[PDB]
From a paper:
We report here the crystal structure at 2.5 Å resolution of [name] from [name] bound to a bisubstrate analogue inhibitor, N-(phosphonoacetyl)-putrescine (PAPU). Phasing of the diffraction data for the [name]-PAPU crystal, using molecular replacement with a polyalanine model of one subunit of Pyrococcus furiosus OTC (pfOTC; 43% identity and 74% identity+similarity for the 315-residue sequence overlapping in pfOTC and [name]), yielded two [name] protomers in the asymmetric unit. The application of the crystal symmetry to the two protomers found in the asymmetric unit of the crystal of [name]-PAPU generates two trimers. The finding in each subunit of the crystals of [name]-PAPU and [name]-PALO of very elongated masses of non-protein electron density that fit extended PAPU and PALO molecules, have clarified how can [name] discriminate between ornithine and putrescine. In the narrow and mainly hydrophobic sheath that encircles the putrescine moiety of PAPU, the phenolic ring of Y233 sits flat as a tile at the site that would be occupied by the α-COO− of ornithine, hampering ornithine but not putrescine binding. This phenolic ring is stabilized in such position by hydrophobic contacts with nearby residues and with the hydrocarbon chain of putrescine, as well as by hydrogen binding of its O atom with the side-chain N atom of Q79* from the 80-loop* of an adjacent subunit. Q79* is crucial for formation by the 80* and 230 loops of a roof over the active center that buries the bound PAPU, and that must be opened and closed in each catalytic cycle to allow substrate access and product release. The roof opening an closing cycle and the catalytic cycle may be synchronized by the hydrogen binding of this N atom of Q79* with an O atom of the phosphonate moiety of PAPU and thus of CP. Although the side chain O atom of Q79* is hydrogen-bonded to one N atom of the imidazole ring of H83* belonging to the 80-loop*, the other N atom of this imidazole is bound to the side-chain carboxylate of E236, of the 230-loop of the subunit hosting the active center. In contrast, both subunits found in the asymmetric unit of the [name]-PAPU complex have well conformed roof and loops over the bound PAPU.
Transcarbamylases are the enzymes that carry out this work, by carbamylating an amine using as donor the carbamyl group of CP. Similarly, agmatine, the decarboxylated analogue of arginine, can be used as a fermentative source of ATP utilizing [name] ([name]) in this process. The subunit body presents the classical transcarbamylase fold, consisting of two domains of similar size and gross fold, the N-domain ([name] residues 1–130 and 301–315), and the C-domain (residues 131–296), corresponding respectively to the polar and equatorial domains of ATC and to the CP and ornithine domains of OTC. Each subunit has a characteristic shape consisting of a hemispheric subunit body and a projecting tail formed by a C-terminal helix (helix 13) that is a characteristic and exclusive [name] feature.
Residue numbers in the entry:
A (entry chain A), B (entry chain A), C (entry chain A): 1 to 340
Write the structure that this text describes.
Amino acid sequence: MKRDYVTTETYTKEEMHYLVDLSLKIKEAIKNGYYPQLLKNKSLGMIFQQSSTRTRVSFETAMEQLGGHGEYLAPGQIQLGGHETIEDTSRVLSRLVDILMARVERHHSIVDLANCATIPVINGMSDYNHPTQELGDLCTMVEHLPEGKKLEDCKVVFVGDATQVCFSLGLITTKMGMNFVHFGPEGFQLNEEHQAKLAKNCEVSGGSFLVTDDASSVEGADFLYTDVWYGLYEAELSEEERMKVFYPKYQVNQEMMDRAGANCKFMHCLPATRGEEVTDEVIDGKNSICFDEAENRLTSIRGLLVYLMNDYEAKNPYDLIKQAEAKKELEVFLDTQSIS
Amino acid sequence: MKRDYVTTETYTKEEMHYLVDLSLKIKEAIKNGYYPQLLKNKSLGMIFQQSSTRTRVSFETAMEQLGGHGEYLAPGQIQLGGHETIEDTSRVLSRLVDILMARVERHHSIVDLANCATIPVINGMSDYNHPTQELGDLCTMVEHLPEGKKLEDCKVVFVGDATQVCFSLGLITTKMGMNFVHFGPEGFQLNEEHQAKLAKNCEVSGGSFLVTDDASSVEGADFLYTDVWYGLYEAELSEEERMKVFYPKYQVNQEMMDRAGANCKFMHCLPATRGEEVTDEVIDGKNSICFDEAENRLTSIRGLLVYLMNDYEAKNPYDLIKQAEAKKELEVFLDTQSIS
Amino acid sequence: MKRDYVTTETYTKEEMHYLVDLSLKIKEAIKNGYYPQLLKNKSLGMIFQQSSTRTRVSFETAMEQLGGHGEYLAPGQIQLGGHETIEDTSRVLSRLVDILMARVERHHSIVDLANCATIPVINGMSDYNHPTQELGDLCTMVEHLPEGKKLEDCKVVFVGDATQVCFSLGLITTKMGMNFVHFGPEGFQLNEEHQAKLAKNCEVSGGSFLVTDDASSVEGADFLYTDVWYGLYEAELSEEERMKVFYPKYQVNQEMMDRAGANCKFMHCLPATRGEEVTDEVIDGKNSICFDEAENRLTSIRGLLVYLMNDYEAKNPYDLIKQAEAKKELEVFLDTQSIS
Ligand SMILES: NCCCCNC(=O)CP(=O)(O)O
Ligand SMILES: NCCCCNC(=O)CP(=O)(O)O
Ligand SMILES: NCCCCNC(=O)CP(=O)(O)O
Ligand code: NI
C-alpha cells in the first residue's frame, strides 16, 4: 500500500499541522547546516508537462539535501505520449523509482498516475489544484502571523483570476479554519462546484469563505495574495485580453495594500508579471513575503517527501534477516567470483 | 585499457551467466533495503538521441542506488551535432566522466563512441541491436523458468517485426543455448546476414533458431515475446501501413497465447501500443511478465555498470601511496593556505 | 555577503595563483582515487542558454565528485523567459540552491544574475568573456611549461577571430604577466576598448600584448591557441562567409606550428571545426594539448566551486549551538511524533 499527495481534500487539519511542523523542523536543521540523510539512495521521478522554477528546483534540491536524487523527466525525453500511456508509464516507473511527482496539463493525468502507481505520487500542479503550494503557503503564514493573532483568526484574500492557486489557497485556508475571500471579477470567480467544496471545509473547520467583486472585501486582510492573469499555459490570454478583464481594479498596488491594512502582508505564488497583477512597489516592498514564500516551496516539499517515504516504508517494511542474508551473499560473490 | 558493452557478440555464455548472477545478487540486496555503494562519486554520461523511459531511468536510478550519478545529455543540449563530431565528443567525455552510455539512431555512432573512448561505453539501443535489453530479458527468463525445465530447454518465440529487439532476443537466446523462433511476415523477417549470426551462435551453444511465417510455430513456446510495429523512430510506419502488414495475424491475443500453451509467459520490451501487437487481455493478464521484465531493465543495468567499472579499475588501479600523498597535501593546503 | 566569478577582472594575479594550486591539488587527489567530500549535500543550479559539453559536464561531474549535485536548468524548462525576469529568477534561486552558474547569450544576463543573487554566481560563458576557460587554460599552461621557462616568460598567440575566448585568453595571460598576441584579420581583431583593458593589465603585471595581422607574429609562440570562425551561436557565419574571411591565412596547419617553433604547443577551447581553424594533423598531433586542456575545464571548475563555497561559508558561518539544537529537536519529532 501507499499514500499520495494529489489534493489536500484527503488530509485533515491535524494531518496538515503535522506536515507543517515536520517541514519546519527539517528547515531549521538545514538552515543551521545539518542535512538530515532521511532519503539515502532514494530516487524521485519528476514528470514536468509545463515550465517550472520553484517546484522543479525544490524537488531536485530536496532530494540532494536528504541524501537522494531527483530525475527530471521532460516531455518527449521519455516515452509518454504517442508511444506510451500514462497508465503504463505509472506502472513501469513504480518499478524504477521510489517516489513520483508530476506537473500536468490536465488533472486526470495526475489522478491516473496516482491510481496506477504502487509508489507515492505527488501533484506538482494541475489545471485544478496546487497542493504543494498550499503546504508551502501554510508554512509561510504560520511563520508570519500578525502579533496577537492565531492562524484561524486570520483573513486571507486572493485577488484576481480563479486560478488553480486561487482555489488551492481556498482549500487550505478553509481546511485550517481560517477566513477566505476570493476578490475577483464576474466570469473569473470560483464557480459553484468550487464554492461547495469550500463550504464543506467550513462546516468541519469553523472557517468562512466569500466570493465577490466588491473592492471593500480586501479591508482587514492579514494576507493579500495574487497570481498572474494569463490563465492556463496551453491557452494563455494575451496582454490586451487580460488587461481588459482585470486592470486597474484587480492590480495589487500600494493603494490596495493600505486599504487592506498597514500590517497586511503580500503573497504571490510566482512567477509574477510585474506591472499587471502587482506593482514593483508592492512585490519588492516592506510588506512582501513572497520570497520567503518561494523558499517555503522547498521547505514544504522536503516535508512531503519525508512523510510519504516514511509512510511507505512503515507499510512496506524491509525484512531485516533477508537484508543481512542479501548483503552477505553479495559480498561473497564480489570477493570470490569472476567473469573469467 | 577498458571493456565495452556494445553487443553480446563479444561475450561468452559463461560471461553472460556471471552478469546475470551479479545483477540478481545486487537486486536481492536492494529489494531488501541494502544499497551497495559500489560506484561512490562516479559519474555516468548518458547520451540519448531517442526517447526512453526504462533505459534512461534505469541508468539514472542505478547510479544513485550505487552511490554515483548519471547525467542526461540530451540532443542539442551538448555540442555534438553541427558543432562537434562523435569522435571528439567521445575523447572529451573520456576526460570528464567515468563511464558512458548512448542510445543512438545509427549503430555506427555507438561503435565510434566506444572505439574513441578510453572509458567503458554501453549501447543503450541502436537500429541494429539492444544488448542491455538482452541481459534484462535473460534475468527475467531465469526468474520465470517453467517448473521442471532448464533455461536451455526453453523455446522463445518472437512475434512480428524484425526489430533490433527481435534480433537481440535471438542473439541472447542462441548464445545461452536456447531454442529461438522469429514468427514474422515475409519482408519483415530477420535477413540472411542476421540468420548467419544466429547460426554461428548455435554451432557453439547447441541451441537452435527458425525464421518463419507459419502460425503453428508459436506452439510449445515457453516465452512468447513481441514489440511494436511502427519500425524506426525517425521514419515510423503509420497506423494504416503497419496494420495492413501485421494485423490480425501477428497480434498477440489470448488465442495465440493458448495456442502457444497454457503455461507460456508473455514478454514485451515496452512501450507497447495496446490493441495492435498485443491486446489488453494478454499484456495485463495472468501470464504477462513484462512488468517484471521492465523492472529487470534496472536489475541488468546495475550489474553491467558494476562489472564494467570493476573491470576498468582492475585494469587501471589507483596507486595507493600516491593517493595517500595527494589526500595529505590537499588537507595541508586547505588548512594552511588562503586566497588573501 | 558573497563573491562571484563573472570576470577575472575582479581577481589579482595572487588570487588566480591560489585558484590554480587549489584546483591542481584537488585534481591529484581525484586522479589517484581520493574524492574529497567538500560540498556534501550542496546544490548547484546550472542555467544554460546555449549548447555545451565541457562546461556543463564539468559542473555536473564536479558536484558529484565533491559530494553534491548539479541541476541542469534548460531554457523553457524553467520559468525564465516570457513568464519571469532574470532578477526574479536570481532572487528565487538564491533561496533554493547554494551556488549558481549560467551560460548566457548576452553578458548583461550573467551580471544581473550575479548582482541580484545572495549566493555565489559563476559565468559559464557570455558574448563578452569566458572566465572558467581562463582558469582551465592557466592550469594547462602551468602543467605544460617549456623546459627552462617560467610562466611569465612565455608567449601565447591566439589565431583568428576576436571571440570571447580570444579576449579571455588575453585577460588571463596579461593578468599573469605573460606575453600575449592576437593574430587576426582586419575587422575581426580585438577592438580598442578590449586592448585598453589588456594595457591596464600589463601596467600592473609587466606583461605585454599585441594585436596584428602580420603572419610572422606566431614566431616564438610557446602556446598557439585557436577557436572556431562561425562567431556567435545565435547569428553564425555560414561556411562560405567565414572561409572567405579567414582561409587559408588563419588556418592552424603544421606549417604554422613549425613557424611558431618545434616546441610550441597547440591549444583550442573546443569544440573544433576540423579543416577550418585547425587541421586534423595539428589537433591530433604530437604538440596538441587541447584534450588535456579539455580535462582541465573540470579541474578548474572543481577549484572555483570549492573556493566560492568556502568563501561563502566563512562569510556566513553556521551557528553550531543552533545546529545541535535543530538536529536534536528534529530527532525527537521523528521518534515521538506521528501524523495520526
Ligand atoms: N496560475 C499559475 C500558478 C503558478 C504557480 N507557480 C509555481 O508553482 C512556481 P513554479 O514551480 O512554476 O516556478
Ligand atoms: N523497437 C523498439 C524497441 C524499444 C525497446 N524499449 C526500451 O528499451 C524501453 P525504453 O528505454 O524505450 O523505455
Ligand atoms: N567561441 C566559442 C567558444 C566556445 C568555448 N567552448 C567551451 O566552453 C566548451 P563547451 O562547454 O561549449 O563544450
Ligand atoms: Ni542529477
